[PDB]
Amino acid sequence: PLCLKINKKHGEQTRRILIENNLLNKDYKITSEGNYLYLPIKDVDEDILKSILNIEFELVDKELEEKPSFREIISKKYRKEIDEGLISLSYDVVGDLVILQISDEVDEKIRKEIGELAYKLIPCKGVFRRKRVRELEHLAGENRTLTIHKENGYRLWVDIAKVYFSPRLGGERARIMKKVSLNDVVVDMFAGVGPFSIACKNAKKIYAIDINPHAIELLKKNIKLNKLEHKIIPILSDVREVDVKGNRVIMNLPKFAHKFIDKALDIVEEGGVIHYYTIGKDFDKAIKLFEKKCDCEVLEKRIVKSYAPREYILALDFKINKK
Ligand SMILES: Nc1ncnc2c1ncn2[C@@H]1O[C@H](C[C@@H](N)CC[C@H](N)C(=O)O)[C@@H](O)[C@H]1O
Ligand SMILES: [Zn+2]
Ligand SMILES: [Zn+2]
Ligand SMILES: [Zn+2]
Ligand SMILES: [Zn+2]
Protein backbone atom coordinates (compact mmCIF):
# COMPACT_ATOMS: atom_id res chain seq x y z
CA PRO A 1 0.00 0.00 0.00
CA LEU A 2 1.19 3.52 0.84
CA CYS A 3 4.76 3.40 2.18
CA LEU A 4 7.34 5.90 3.43
CA LYS A 5 10.57 5.28 1.55
CA ILE A 6 13.78 6.28 3.35
CA ASN A 7 17.47 5.35 3.39
CA LYS A 8 17.69 2.44 5.82
CA LYS A 9 20.37 4.09 7.96
CA HIS A 10 17.51 6.09 9.50
CA GLY A 11 15.32 3.00 10.02
CA GLU A 12 14.75 2.64 13.77
CA GLN A 13 14.64 6.38 14.31
CA THR A 14 11.93 6.91 11.66
CA ARG A 15 9.91 3.90 12.88
CA ARG A 16 9.82 5.33 16.40
CA ILE A 17 8.75 8.74 15.12
CA LEU A 18 5.95 7.13 13.06
CA ILE A 19 4.73 5.08 15.98
CA GLU A 20 4.50 8.04 18.32
CA ASN A 21 2.46 9.88 15.71
CA ASN A 22 0.07 6.99 15.11
CA LEU A 23 1.27 6.77 11.48
CA LEU A 24 2.72 3.25 11.33
CA ASN A 25 0.32 0.88 9.58
CA LYS A 26 0.94 -2.20 11.76
CA ASP A 27 -0.89 -4.52 9.38
CA TYR A 28 2.12 -4.80 7.12
CA LYS A 29 5.75 -5.74 7.32
CA ILE A 30 8.28 -2.96 7.22
CA THR A 31 10.43 -4.27 4.38
CA SER A 32 14.03 -3.62 3.45
CA GLU A 33 15.10 -3.75 -0.15
CA GLY A 34 18.58 -2.74 -1.18
CA ASN A 35 19.58 0.12 1.05
CA TYR A 36 16.03 1.39 1.43
CA LEU A 37 13.47 0.81 4.09
CA TYR A 38 9.78 0.79 3.26
CA LEU A 39 7.40 1.59 6.10
CA PRO A 40 3.66 1.08 5.57
CA ILE A 41 2.05 4.32 6.65
CA LYS A 42 -1.48 5.53 7.34
CA ASP A 43 -3.18 8.32 5.38
CA VAL A 44 -0.80 11.27 5.48
CA ASP A 45 0.66 13.95 3.21
CA GLU A 46 4.28 14.89 2.54
CA ASP A 47 3.92 18.43 3.82
CA ILE A 48 3.11 17.63 7.44
CA LEU A 49 5.70 14.84 7.54
CA LYS A 50 8.31 17.55 6.94
CA SER A 51 7.35 18.99 10.32
CA ILE A 52 8.29 15.73 12.10
CA LEU A 53 11.21 14.53 9.92
CA ASN A 54 14.42 16.28 8.78
CA ILE A 55 15.69 13.44 6.60
CA GLU A 56 14.69 13.02 2.96
CA PHE A 57 11.81 10.70 2.09
CA GLU A 58 9.37 9.56 -0.55
CA LEU A 59 5.76 8.40 -0.20
CA VAL A 60 5.02 5.51 -2.60
CA ASP A 61 2.75 2.56 -3.45
CA LYS A 62 3.98 -1.02 -2.97
CA GLU A 63 2.82 -4.56 -2.26
CA LEU A 64 4.01 -5.77 1.12
CA GLU A 65 3.14 -8.83 3.18
CA GLU A 66 1.19 -8.68 6.45
CA LYS A 67 2.45 -8.92 10.02
CA PRO A 68 -12.24 -15.19 9.28
CA SER A 69 -12.12 -11.44 10.07
CA PHE A 70 -14.91 -8.98 9.14
CA ARG A 71 -12.90 -6.20 7.55
CA GLU A 72 -11.69 -9.03 5.35
CA ILE A 73 -15.16 -10.17 4.31
CA ILE A 74 -17.04 -6.86 4.21
CA SER A 75 -14.24 -5.40 2.10
CA LYS A 76 -15.04 -7.68 -0.83
CA LYS A 77 -18.77 -8.31 -0.51
CA TYR A 78 -19.75 -4.65 -0.18
CA ARG A 79 -16.66 -3.16 -1.85
CA LYS A 80 -19.22 -1.68 -4.22
CA GLU A 81 -20.70 0.76 -1.71
CA ILE A 82 -17.74 0.70 0.66
CA ASP A 83 -15.70 1.86 -2.30
CA GLU A 84 -17.97 4.88 -2.41
CA GLY A 85 -18.57 5.87 1.21
CA LEU A 86 -21.84 4.19 2.30
CA ILE A 87 -19.79 1.79 4.36
CA SER A 88 -16.45 2.29 6.07
CA LEU A 89 -14.02 -0.45 7.07
CA SER A 90 -13.26 1.47 10.24
CA TYR A 91 -15.20 0.83 13.43
CA ASP A 92 -14.86 1.46 17.17
CA VAL A 93 -15.02 -0.87 20.11
CA VAL A 94 -16.04 0.88 23.32
CA GLY A 95 -15.90 -1.62 26.13
CA ASP A 96 -18.52 -4.24 25.27
CA LEU A 97 -20.06 -2.63 22.18
CA VAL A 98 -19.12 -2.24 18.55
CA ILE A 99 -20.03 0.82 16.52
CA LEU A 100 -19.90 0.45 12.78
CA GLN A 101 -19.63 3.32 10.39
CA ILE A 102 -22.52 2.70 8.05
CA SER A 103 -23.57 5.96 6.52
CA ASP A 104 -27.02 4.55 5.89
CA GLU A 105 -28.50 4.69 2.41
CA VAL A 106 -27.73 1.03 2.50
CA ASP A 107 -30.97 -0.89 3.03
CA GLU A 108 -32.07 -1.59 6.57
CA LYS A 109 -31.87 -5.36 6.40
CA ILE A 110 -28.52 -4.86 4.68
CA ARG A 111 -27.44 -2.89 7.76
CA LYS A 112 -28.69 -5.68 10.03
CA GLU A 113 -26.66 -8.15 7.98
CA ILE A 114 -23.43 -6.24 8.39
CA GLY A 115 -24.15 -5.67 12.07
CA GLU A 116 -24.96 -9.38 12.32
CA LEU A 117 -21.71 -10.29 10.65
CA ALA A 118 -19.86 -7.92 13.01
CA TYR A 119 -21.74 -9.39 15.96
CA LYS A 120 -20.64 -12.81 14.79
CA LEU A 121 -16.99 -12.16 14.00
CA ILE A 122 -16.25 -9.51 16.64
CA PRO A 123 -16.34 -10.40 20.36
CA CYS A 124 -18.97 -8.02 21.72
CA LYS A 125 -22.44 -8.04 23.21
CA GLY A 126 -23.96 -5.35 21.05
CA VAL A 127 -23.51 -3.66 17.67
CA PHE A 128 -24.71 -0.26 16.52
CA ARG A 129 -23.98 2.25 13.82
CA ARG A 130 -24.52 6.02 13.87
CA LYS A 131 -26.75 8.72 12.32
CA ARG A 132 -21.24 15.70 18.80
CA VAL A 133 -23.27 12.97 20.47
CA ARG A 134 -25.43 11.31 17.79
CA GLU A 135 -28.36 8.89 17.89
CA LEU A 136 -27.58 5.22 17.46
CA GLU A 137 -29.21 2.48 15.46
CA HIS A 138 -29.13 -0.93 17.04
CA LEU A 139 -28.13 -3.76 14.67
CA ALA A 140 -27.39 -6.92 16.73
CA GLY A 141 -26.72 -8.52 20.09
CA GLU A 142 -27.66 -6.83 23.37
CA ASN A 143 -29.30 -3.46 22.89
CA ARG A 144 -27.58 -1.79 25.85
CA THR A 145 -25.54 1.34 25.17
CA LEU A 146 -24.07 1.56 28.67
CA THR A 147 -20.78 -0.31 29.16
CA ILE A 148 -17.41 -0.17 30.84
CA HIS A 149 -14.24 0.45 28.85
CA LYS A 150 -10.80 -0.54 30.09
CA GLU A 151 -7.66 1.42 29.13
CA ASN A 152 -4.28 2.18 30.68
CA GLY A 153 -5.09 0.32 33.88
CA TYR A 154 -8.32 2.11 34.74
CA ARG A 155 -12.01 1.64 34.08
CA LEU A 156 -14.60 3.95 32.50
CA TRP A 157 -18.39 3.75 32.44
CA VAL A 158 -19.60 5.07 29.10
CA ASP A 159 -23.05 5.34 27.61
CA ILE A 160 -22.39 5.72 23.90
CA ALA A 161 -25.79 7.18 23.20
CA LYS A 162 -25.37 9.89 25.83
CA VAL A 163 -21.82 11.25 25.70
CA TYR A 164 -18.92 11.48 23.31
CA PHE A 165 -16.05 9.05 23.81
CA SER A 166 -13.22 7.90 21.55
CA PRO A 167 -11.31 4.75 22.54
CA ARG A 168 -8.70 5.76 19.98
CA LEU A 169 -7.43 8.47 22.34
CA GLY A 170 -6.19 5.95 24.89
CA GLY A 171 -2.65 6.36 23.61
CA GLU A 172 -2.75 10.14 23.85
CA ARG A 173 -4.22 9.80 27.39
CA ALA A 174 -1.44 7.45 28.42
CA ARG A 175 1.09 9.99 27.10
CA ILE A 176 -0.30 12.70 29.33
CA MET A 177 -0.82 10.36 32.28
CA LYS A 178 2.94 9.85 32.61
CA LYS A 179 3.87 13.55 32.47
CA VAL A 180 1.73 14.40 35.47
CA SER A 181 3.57 15.36 38.67
CA LEU A 182 2.46 14.81 42.27
CA ASN A 183 2.01 18.46 43.06
CA ASP A 184 0.04 19.27 39.92
CA VAL A 185 -3.48 20.68 40.06
CA VAL A 186 -5.19 19.76 36.76
CA VAL A 187 -8.12 21.46 35.04
CA ASP A 188 -9.81 19.15 32.52
CA MET A 189 -11.81 21.77 30.65
CA PHE A 190 -13.97 19.38 28.55
CA ALA A 191 -13.95 16.19 30.59
CA GLY A 192 -16.68 14.01 29.08
CA VAL A 193 -16.96 11.01 31.39
CA GLY A 194 -13.52 11.83 32.79
CA PRO A 195 -10.87 9.93 30.70
CA PHE A 196 -8.08 12.55 31.01
CA SER A 197 -9.06 13.22 34.58
CA ILE A 198 -8.77 9.56 35.67
CA ALA A 199 -5.55 9.39 33.61
CA CYS A 200 -4.12 12.35 35.58
CA LYS A 201 -4.60 10.54 38.93
CA ASN A 202 -0.98 11.28 39.96
CA ALA A 203 -1.94 14.92 40.56
CA LYS A 204 -3.06 16.11 43.95
CA LYS A 205 -6.21 17.75 42.69
CA ILE A 206 -8.18 17.64 39.46
CA TYR A 207 -11.17 19.78 38.32
CA ALA A 208 -13.24 17.85 35.72
CA ILE A 209 -15.66 20.12 33.90
CA ASP A 210 -18.35 19.42 31.36
CA ILE A 211 -21.58 21.05 30.23
CA ASN A 212 -23.41 17.74 29.53
CA PRO A 213 -25.10 16.43 32.73
CA HIS A 214 -25.15 12.78 31.70
CA ALA A 215 -21.40 13.13 31.07
CA ILE A 216 -21.12 14.45 34.61
CA GLU A 217 -23.17 11.53 35.86
CA LEU A 218 -20.77 9.03 34.27
CA LEU A 219 -17.80 11.10 35.51
CA LYS A 220 -19.02 10.73 39.12
CA LYS A 221 -19.54 6.99 38.72
CA ASN A 222 -16.01 6.83 37.31
CA ILE A 223 -14.49 8.91 40.07
CA LYS A 224 -15.90 6.39 42.57
CA LEU A 225 -15.03 3.29 40.63
CA ASN A 226 -11.40 4.37 40.43
CA LYS A 227 -11.48 5.57 44.03
CA LEU A 228 -10.56 9.18 43.28
CA GLU A 229 -13.36 10.96 45.21
CA HIS A 230 -10.93 12.98 47.30
CA LYS A 231 -8.89 13.95 44.24
CA ILE A 232 -11.26 14.84 41.36
CA ILE A 233 -13.92 17.52 41.61
CA PRO A 234 -16.75 17.09 39.08
CA ILE A 235 -18.25 20.29 37.70
CA LEU A 236 -21.47 20.66 35.71
CA SER A 237 -21.19 23.93 33.81
CA ASP A 238 -20.04 25.72 30.69
CA VAL A 239 -16.30 25.94 31.32
CA ARG A 240 -16.43 29.68 30.53
CA GLU A 241 -18.30 30.30 33.78
CA VAL A 242 -15.96 28.32 36.01
CA ASP A 243 -13.39 30.05 38.16
CA VAL A 244 -10.59 27.66 39.04
CA LYS A 245 -6.84 27.67 38.76
CA GLY A 246 -4.31 25.01 37.81
CA ASN A 247 -0.83 24.39 36.45
CA ARG A 248 -1.91 21.69 33.97
CA VAL A 249 -4.81 22.51 31.71
CA ILE A 250 -6.37 20.10 29.20
CA MET A 251 -8.31 21.26 26.14
CA ASN A 252 -9.69 18.12 24.52
CA LEU A 253 -12.22 19.81 22.12
CA PRO A 254 -10.45 19.65 18.69
CA LYS A 255 -12.89 21.50 16.47
CA PHE A 256 -13.40 24.45 18.80
CA ALA A 257 -10.54 24.58 21.31
CA HIS A 258 -9.19 27.65 19.49
CA LYS A 259 -12.21 29.61 20.74
CA PHE A 260 -11.39 28.88 24.37
CA ILE A 261 -7.70 29.83 24.58
CA ASP A 262 -8.34 33.09 26.42
CA LYS A 263 -10.27 31.23 29.12
CA ALA A 264 -7.52 28.59 29.27
CA LEU A 265 -4.77 31.23 29.76
CA ASP A 266 -6.86 32.67 32.57
CA ILE A 267 -7.02 29.30 34.32
CA VAL A 268 -3.38 28.36 33.84
CA GLU A 269 -0.74 29.60 36.29
CA GLU A 270 2.45 30.98 34.75
CA GLY A 271 5.05 28.29 34.25
CA GLY A 272 2.22 25.85 33.81
CA VAL A 273 1.22 23.73 30.85
CA ILE A 274 -1.71 23.65 28.42
CA HIS A 275 -2.39 20.44 26.44
CA TYR A 276 -4.10 21.78 23.32
CA TYR A 277 -6.06 19.66 20.85
CA THR A 278 -7.02 21.00 17.43
CA ILE A 279 -7.74 20.06 13.83
CA GLY A 280 -5.27 21.19 11.15
CA LYS A 281 -3.20 20.45 8.04
CA ASP A 282 -0.18 20.93 10.30
CA PHE A 283 1.04 22.57 13.54
CA ASP A 284 1.72 26.13 12.27
CA LYS A 285 -1.69 27.72 12.89
CA ALA A 286 -1.93 26.55 16.52
CA ILE A 287 1.60 27.71 17.30
CA LYS A 288 0.85 31.14 15.86
CA LEU A 289 -2.41 31.51 17.84
CA PHE A 290 -0.53 30.77 21.06
CA GLU A 291 2.54 32.86 20.22
CA LYS A 292 0.37 35.93 19.74
CA LYS A 293 -1.58 35.33 22.96
CA CYS A 294 1.34 34.84 25.33
CA ASP A 295 5.00 33.92 25.68
CA CYS A 296 5.17 30.14 25.37
CA GLU A 297 7.17 27.14 24.26
CA VAL A 298 6.08 23.92 22.61
CA LEU A 299 7.29 20.95 24.69
CA GLU A 300 6.05 18.03 22.58
CA LYS A 301 3.58 17.81 19.68
CA ARG A 302 1.95 14.78 18.12
CA ILE A 303 -0.36 13.90 15.30
CA VAL A 304 -3.21 12.04 17.07
CA LYS A 305 -5.25 10.66 14.17
CA SER A 306 -6.63 11.53 10.75
CA TYR A 307 -9.75 13.63 10.31
CA ALA A 308 -9.97 13.81 6.51
CA PRO A 309 -7.43 14.25 3.72
CA ARG A 310 -4.69 16.72 4.72
CA GLU A 311 -6.65 17.22 7.95
CA TYR A 312 -5.62 15.85 11.33
CA ILE A 313 -6.36 16.03 15.00
CA LEU A 314 -3.21 17.40 16.59
CA ALA A 315 -1.89 17.69 20.12
CA LEU A 316 0.57 20.29 21.37
CA ASP A 317 1.86 20.76 24.93
CA PHE A 318 2.54 24.50 25.42
CA LYS A 319 4.53 25.74 28.37
CA ILE A 320 3.14 29.16 29.37
CA ASN A 321 6.08 31.32 30.50
CA LYS A 322 4.31 34.66 30.94
CA LYS A 323 0.77 35.80 30.21
N1 LIG B 1 -18.60 25.13 26.88
C1 LIG B 1 -18.28 23.93 27.37
N2 LIG B 1 -17.89 23.80 28.65
C2 LIG B 1 -17.60 22.61 29.15
N3 LIG B 1 -17.68 21.51 28.43
C3 LIG B 1 -18.06 21.57 27.14
C4 LIG B 1 -18.37 22.80 26.57
N4 LIG B 1 -18.70 22.57 25.31
C5 LIG B 1 -18.62 21.26 25.08
N5 LIG B 1 -18.22 20.65 26.19
C6 LIG B 1 -17.87 19.22 26.31
O1 LIG B 1 -16.63 19.05 25.61
C7 LIG B 1 -16.51 17.62 25.47
C8 LIG B 1 -15.55 17.34 24.31
C9 LIG B 1 -15.12 15.87 24.30
N6 LIG B 1 -14.13 15.69 23.23
C10 LIG B 1 -14.48 15.50 25.64
C11 LIG B 1 -13.90 14.09 25.55
C12 LIG B 1 -13.26 13.67 26.87
N7 LIG B 1 -12.19 14.62 27.24
C13 LIG B 1 -12.67 12.26 26.74
O2 LIG B 1 -11.44 12.13 26.89
O3 LIG B 1 -13.48 11.34 26.47
C14 LIG B 1 -17.93 17.07 25.31
O4 LIG B 1 -18.19 16.12 26.34
C15 LIG B 1 -18.81 18.31 25.51
O5 LIG B 1 -19.92 17.98 26.35
ZN1 LIG C 1 -28.34 11.11 32.53
ZN1 LIG D 1 -12.83 14.41 50.08
ZN1 LIG E 1 -15.04 16.09 21.28
ZN1 LIG F 1 1.78 31.73 23.83
Curated annotation (Swiss-Prot):
**What outcome follows a substitution of P213A?**
16-fold decrease in methyltransferase activity
Q: What is its main location?
A: cytoplasm
What is the recorded phenotype of mutating Y164A? 20-fold decrease in methyltransferase activity. Reduced affinity for tRNA
Q: Name one GO cellular component term.
A: cytoplasm
Query: Which UniProt keyword terms apply here?
Result: Cytoplasm, Methyltransferase, S-adenosyl-L-methionine, Transferase, tRNA processing
Query: Per its UniProt record, what Gene3D superfamilies does this chain match?
Result: 3.30.70.2580, Met-10+ protein-like domains, Vaccinia Virus protein VP39
The record lists the catalysed reaction(s) as:
guanosine(37) in tRNA + S-adenosyl-L-methionine = N(1)-methylguanosine(37) in tRNA + S-adenosyl-L-homocysteine + H(+)
Q: Does the keyword Transferase apply?
A: yes
The UniProt entry, under InterPro entries, shows: MeTrfase_TRM5/TYW2 (IPR030382), SAM-dependent_MTases_sf (IPR029063), TRM5-TYW2-like_MTfase (IPR056743), TRM5/TYW2-like_N (IPR056744), Trm5a/b_N (IPR040601)
Indicate where this protein resides in the cell.
Answer: Cytoplasm
The residues listed in the UniProt record as binding S-adenosyl-L-methionine, with positions renumbered to this chain, are R173, D210, I211, D238, V239, N252
The name of this protein is tRNA (guanine(37)-N(1))-methyltransferase Trm5b
Name the source organism.
Methanocaldococcus jannaschii (strain ATCC 43067 / DSM 2661 / JAL-1 / JCM 10045 / NBRC 100440) (Methanococcus jannaschii)
Q: What is the lineage of its organism?
A: Archaea, Methanobacteriati, Methanobacteriota, Methanomada group, Methanococci
By which gene is this protein encoded? trm5b
